[PDB]
Design a protein around this ligand. Sequence first.
Ligand code: D85
Ligand code: ZN
Length: 257
Amino acid sequence: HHWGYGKHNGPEHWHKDFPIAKGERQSPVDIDTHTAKYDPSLKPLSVSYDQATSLRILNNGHAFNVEFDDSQDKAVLKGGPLDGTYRLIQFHFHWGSLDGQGSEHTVDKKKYAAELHLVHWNTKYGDFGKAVQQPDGLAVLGIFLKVGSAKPGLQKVVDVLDSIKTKGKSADFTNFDPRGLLPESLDYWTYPGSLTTPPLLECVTWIVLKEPISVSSEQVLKFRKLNFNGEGEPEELMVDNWRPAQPLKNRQIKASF
Ligand SMILES: NS(=O)(=O)c1ccc(N(CCC(=O)O)c2nc(-c3ccc(Cl)cc3)c(Cl)s2)cc1
Ligand SMILES: [Zn+2]
């Protein structure tokens, strides 16, 4: 009886196995755009993905992860609110069963169809597993998805999904350029938070871009064909794999703009 999204093991249950679910810096949160404070001391975000090495795509039973080579100073995030260098390890999404829901963060209570998380770890801590034990261990770049025109830089992901339908399936996934998932503007909100899945560790500097990307209905429909179950188990569509907004508590969300 492990955690999930389902009718009986979803977010409202996580606290029993992961008490930190009721912690002081949980994510996601609703971004109240009028209360976010512009911080002129915030720097432009530096996204350096030209040398990114994607390796594999994996259905982990909760989402799919596009994994990168993070054994060298390739694909890093710096600047913004960050001190030092964070290296890209993977990206994944959260999405809904319908277009009207799926994002984890919300903006003035608006839900987006989906949200992309580009996960990076602080090089000061030497790898990802040690980084998650630190308050400044990770930086996750969150990007909202809205349904409209297709995102041509997403299609290579969409088309491989049928090869990783079920939990535990993986596929080679080389030469994928995550720059094709970015919007034009890097304006952002930032705040200290957590992983949004178990173990829910309080180790993340969240950087949420204001400008959403567009994807087509066909692209998100293909996300919704994935399965949470393993092959040869009853089919459970991989939909609504998002944690709802958590209490902001004693936090300030800062805007770069
Ligand atoms: N949604 S989010 O907050 O960006 C987000 C970002 C990252 C994760 N992942 C990947 C989980 C997976 O693929 O199953 C974590 N893996 C670990 C982990 C650490 C140590 C070991 Cl030995 C094994 C796994 C975490 Cl701790 S967090 C989950 C949510
Ligand atoms: Zn995520």
